[PDB]
């Protein structure tokens, strides 16, 4: 897609080894935030979005937290509290041909900078302080988009780079998506180390009368530690308490 | 170098309709508005109106808003004009020309060029019986 | 749309310098003030001889100079020479975001 | 393209060893095992044994264990095979082929190919009196 009306695709109810991506040589730029790429496979996520678009090469610097500019002001922007990853690679072999291939467009005028993740498909004409512009375009009243052209001879800094951002939140259960790992039989009453699609810790796991309502998928104590959880393989309520300890 | 290549000469009897084409080359098609201009032999060479490759949509004068249409085939870097009439007066040379365009310049962006820099050789419509 | 006022032909300038008026109405020359002048030699498509009201494009001889506002615009020629003569068409930017053009005038070196 | 420059033809009397060679060319030689295969004239092209260019490591069918040996002069990008004895039945016509290889994924590594891609022209050795 164009960066104007960049294409969100949701990724859900699935498993994926992320590293199958970046171990291939093609992905010229890659940077994650709030998580480390090589360890992504250990985590699970509430929900995932892949936001996909093409932008001019020297613009890719702007697809990052905080940084801003004529693309990030008006076409797509990422929050300050971002977590996720940004990926982009050269596409002058693909979205570019001898005469230029003008199908790719971007918004260049807007009345205000975007909120984060705002998609604004509005083609409406931008009036820079005019009386009502009737929908003609002219003296100080502009159409807001422009094309890139991307002719193959064009200098590489302006050649098109295809971008994908993955956005995902690492808050605990439910989690429609996980990185792969095989899994164990359960054990209870004895002292164990545990995880639950994340939710790592240690304790004794006990059956409990704790009356979780059907939607509740992990549970916390008055100390705000995780204190009870549901087994994601079987929906049983497991009640945690730490293993016995003290001063000697 | 930048150039326009208008389509060849054409003919159309009275009350028909006619269309002409203008390919553009050595050039960036979406940089600039396509203007048209024309006139009969020895007339004012003063026709005016334009189409925007970035956008579609058009503007053309009060004697013609309702009598002309303009099109683009952007992957083919080409613009078209058609006149839905064949008035006896409509004859002789029609030219296509690179006109208005964006010229964003440091911080500010704006429309910049307002003078139609380069013109095709045009074509003669011969629009009469 | 009404064409811009433009007198018939230059005279009193067998070489040297003389000016063509382009006296338009307020919604064109007095408004946005982007007037331009183009020369249309026989058959060939006209050249963009003056870009904004006072000033030259590249490849224009340093004799031609556009002028004025308050009154509507004019082009002042200089050093007129037997290759340069042709016909000059004024053009202007109108209120309605279309341009409008002048009726032309014909040069006449001796 | 990948190619195997197999050695020339040879002749030997029975009961004396003979040694063919195969210049691995145009590919990463260490990327693939070298397989020998052979065909007495008009019989099954069924001989099998291989050498790993990463190693001194080889295997042979039982009928040839202690009767054939393979080596590789890796910087010269050649594999050699010596038939230790030239039984009069050998009537040799032998080929070398780019066989099994590592081919590690983008993901975790494995011994991918299990397959023979490309074959040299092979050489006749006429092993009889
Ligand atoms: C040394 O350092 C210095 C800096 O210290 C460098 O100097 C500058 O370099 C830059 C880049 O090289 C030059 O930028 C070019 O600017 C023109 C436009 O110029 C504007 O200003 C002019 C007057 O200063 C005026 O003549 C122009 O018309 C234009 O005015 C603006 O736009 C319009 C039209 O005039 C008008 O606004 C109107 O206002 C109404 C409201 O009233 C509405 O807003 C309307 O919508 C609007 O039309 C105003 O006059 C004004 N705007 C406002 C808001 O006030 C750009 O066109 C040009 O971009 C083109 O060219 C780029 C490549 O540049 C090369 O090609 C151009 C010709 O295309 C040539 O001029 C240039 O020298 C160079 O050869 C290209 O990438 C673009 O895509 C586009 O095609 C540039 O942005 C700048 O001119 C120059 N400084 C000065 C004082 O000129 C210098 O480069 C260093 N020396 C070196 C490197 O050797
Ligand atoms: C967007 O587009 C991209 C381009 O279209 C696309 O890309 C993908 O990238 C994939 C890898 O990132 C690639 O698929 C893999 O590649 C493996 C390695 O291949 C690379 O290296 C070799 C050698 O250098 C190259 O020849 C090869 O070239 C190809 O790809 C390049 C680009 O990389 C092209 O230029 C070129 O033209 C070629 O297309 C590549 O560079 C392959 O190994 C792998 O094949 C395995 O997996 C297949 C899928 O499962 C399977 O079909 C195969 O059979 C093979 O399976 C494994 O092999 C053994 C046989 O099954 C088996 O071994 C035994 O298993 C036993 C089990 O008990 C036991 O373990 C034994 O010990 C063990 O030896 C393995 O176990 C098998 N695996 C498993 C899991 O069982 C596959 O080709 C892909 O080609 C490439 N696309 C293209 C068009 O080339 C990119 O991926 C997408 N985007 C996304 C998100 O996917």
Q: Which residues of A touch C52 (CB under 8 A)?
A: none
CA distance B20 to A135: 27
Please give the residue range of the domain that contains residue C93: 18-106
Give the tokens for residue C97: 């975001």
Half-sphere exposure of B81 (CA within 13 A, CB side): 29
- Which residues make Cβ contacts (< 8 Å) with residue C26, sequence separation at least 6? none
Nearest residue of A to residue D104, measured between CA atoms: A23
Q: How far apart are CA A36 and CA A40, in angstroms?
A: 6
> Ligand 1: does its nearest atom lie under 6 Å from the Cβ of A140?
yes
Contact call for residues B6 and B35 (beta carbons, < 8 A): no
The answer to whether residues B94 and B122 touch, using CB atoms and an 8 Å cutoff, is: yes
User: H or E segment at C37?
Assistant: strand C36-39
Q: How far is CA A15 from CA A12, A71, A90, A165, A192, in A?
A: 9, 33, 27, 18, 26
User: Which of B25, B30, B72, B76 to mutate to test binding with chain A, by most A CBs within 10 Å of its CB?
Assistant: B30
B124 interaction partners in chain C (CB closer than 8 Å): none
Q: Which ligand is nearest to the CA of A158?
A: 1
Beta carbon of B115 within 6 Å of any ligand 1 atom: no
Q: Alpha-carbon distance A85 to A31, whole Å?
A: 6
Q: What angle do CA A120, A126, A128 make, to 5 degrees?
A: 135
Beta bridge partners of A19: none
Cβ neighbours around A185 below 10 Å, total: 5
Tokens describing residue B113: 């060029």
Report how far residue C71's alpha carbon sits from residue C101's, in angstroms, rounded to the nearest whole number: 17
- Helix ranges restricted to H, chain D: none
Rounded CA separation C96/C28 (Å): 9
CA distance B93 to A80: 59
Q: Which candidate, A246, A79, A58, A100, places its Cα nearest to that of A167?
A: A79
List the end-to-end C-alpha distance of chain B, in Å, as a whole number: 39
Nearest 5°: the CA angle D74, D75, D81 is 35
Rg (CA), chain A: 24
| Contact criterion met (CB < 8 Å) for D106 and A23 | yes
Going by C-alpha positions, the residue among C80, C94, C85, C83 that lies closest to residue C35 is C94
List of residues 6+ apart from A236 with CB closer than 8 A: A186, A207, A230
Output the CA angle C85-C88-C92, nearest 5 degrees: 160
A153 phi and psi, to 5 degrees? -75, -15
Asked if A136 reaches chain B (Cβ–Cβ under 8 Å), the answer is: yes
Report yes or no on C10 lying in a domain.
Answer: no
**Residue B65 is encoded by which pair of tokens?**
């808003």
Please state the domain count of chain C.
Answer: 1
DSSP line for B59-101: EE-TTTTTTEEEEEEGGGTEEEEEES---GGG-SEEEEEEEEE
Could you count the other beta carbons within 10 Å of the beta carbon of residue A201? 14
3-state SS class at A103: coil
**Which pair of tokens denotes residue B17?**
């309709």
Fold exhibited by the domain B3-124: Immunoglobulin-like (2.60.40)
A136 vs A57: CA distance, rounded Å: 33
Torsion angle in degrees (nearest 10) through CA of B35, B36, B38, B44: -30
Q: Which residues of A touch C27 (CB under 8 A)?
A: none
* Sequence-ordered list of residues with C-beta below 8 angstroms from that of D113, at least 6 positions apart, any chain: D32, D99, D100, D101, D103
Of A133, A36, A141, nearest to A85 (Cα)? A36
Candidates A136, A123, C99, C29; CA nearest to B99 is C99
Can you tell me the distance from the alpha carbon of D62 to that of B28, in angstroms, rounded to the nearest whole number? 72
Is C59 inside a domain boundary? yes
Q: Is D103 in the pocket of ligand 2 (CB under 6 A)?
A: yes
Q: Chain A contact for B74, CB < 8 A?
A: yes
Ligand 2, atom 63, lies closest to the CA of D112
B18 touches B86 (CB < 8 A): yes
Nearest-angstrom CA–CA distance, C61 and C71: 25
Residue C22 inside a domain? The answer is yes
The three-state secondary structure class of D3 is: strand
The three-class DSSP label of residue A34 is coil
- Tokens linked to A30: 């890659």
Structure token pair of residue B35: 């203007």
Q: Which of B33, B103, B111 has most ligand 1 atoms within 8 Å of its beta carbon, as the pocket-test mutant?
A: B103
CATH number at C99 reads 2.60.40.10
CB C63 within 8 A of CB C52: no
Q: Do A102 and B111 touch (CB under 8 A)?
A: no
Among D20, D47, D18, D44, smallest CA distance to D35 is for: D47
* C11 domain-assigned: no
Are A2 and A53 within 8 A, CB to CB?
A: yes
CB contact at 8 A, C53 and C39: no
Q: How many CB atoms lie within 10 A of CB B31?
A: 19
User: How far, in Å, CA of D73 to CA of A246, rounded?
Assistant: 67
Within 10 Å of residue A33's Cβ, how many Cβ atoms?
Answer: 14
Place of tokens 């159409």: A143
Provide the terminal-to-terminal Cα distance of chain C, rounded to the nearest Å. 35
What ranges make up the beta strands (E) of A139-247? Answer: 141-142, 145-147, 160-168, 177-178, 191-194, 201-207, 218-220, 226-230, 237-241
């Amino acid at each position: 897609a164009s960066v104007y009306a960049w294409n969100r695709k949701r990724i859900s109810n699935c498993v994926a080894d992320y590293s199958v991506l970046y171990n291939s040589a093609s992905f010229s730029t890659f940077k994650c935030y709030g998580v480390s790429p090589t360890k992504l496979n250990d985590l699970c996520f509430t929900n995932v979005y892949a936001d996909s678009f093409v932008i001019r090469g020297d613009e890719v610097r702007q697809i990052a937290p905080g940084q801003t500019g004529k693309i990030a002001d008006y076409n797509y922007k990422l929050p300050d509290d971002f977590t996720g990853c940004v990926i982009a690679w050269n596409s002058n072999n693909l979205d570019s041909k001898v005469g230029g291939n003008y199908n790719y467009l971007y918004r260049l005028f807007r009345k205000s900078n975007l909120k984060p993740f705002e998609r604004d498909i509005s083609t409406e004409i931008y009036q820079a302080g005019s009386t009502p512009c009737n929908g003609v375009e002219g003296f100080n009243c502009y159409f807001p988009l422009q094309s890139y052209g991307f002719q193959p001879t064009n200098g590489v800094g302006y050649q098109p780079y295809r971008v994908v951002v993955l956005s995902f939140e690492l808050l605990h259960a439910p989690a429609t998506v996980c990185g792969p790992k095989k899994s164990t039989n359960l054990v209870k009453n004895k002292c164990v180390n545990f995880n639950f699609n994340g939710l790592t810790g240690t304790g004794v796991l006990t059956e409990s009368n704790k009356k979780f309502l059907p939607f509740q998928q992990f549970g916390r104590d008055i100390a705000d530690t995780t204190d009870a959880v549901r087994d994601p393989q079987t929906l049983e309520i497991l009640d945690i308490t730490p293993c016995s300890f003290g001063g000697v | 170098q930048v150039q326009l290549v208008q389509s060849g000469a054409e003919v159309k009897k009275p009350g028909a309709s006619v269309k002409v084409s203008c390919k553009a080359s050595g050039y960036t098609f979406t940089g600039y508005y396509m203007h048209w201009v024309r006139q009969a032999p020895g007339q004012g060479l003063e026709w005016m109106g334009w189409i925007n490759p970035n956008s579609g949509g058009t503007n053309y004068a009060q004697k013609f808003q309702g009598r002309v249409t303009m099109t683009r085939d952007t992957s083919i870097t080409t613009a078209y004009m058609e006149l839905r009439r064949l008035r006896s007066d409509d004859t002789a040379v029609y030219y296509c020309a690179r006109g208005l365009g964006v010229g964003c310049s440091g911080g500010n962006c704006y429309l910049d060029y307002y003078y139609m820099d380069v013109w095709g050789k045009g074509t003669t419509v011969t629009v009469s019986s | 749309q009404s064409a811009l006022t433009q007198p018939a032909s230059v005279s009193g300038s067998p070489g040297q310098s003389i000016t063509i008026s382009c006296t338009g109405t307020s919604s064109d020359v007095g408004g946005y003030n982007y007037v331009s002048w183009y020369q249309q030699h026989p058959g060939k498509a006209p050249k963009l001889m003056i870009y904004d009201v006072s000033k030259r494009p590249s490849g224009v001889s340093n004799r031609f100079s556009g002028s004025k506002s308050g009154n509507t615009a004019s082009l002042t020629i200089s050093g007129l020479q037997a290759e340069d003569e042709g016909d000059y068409y004024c053009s202007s930017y109108t209120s309605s975001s279309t341009w409008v053009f002048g009726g032309g005038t014909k040069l006449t070196v001796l």
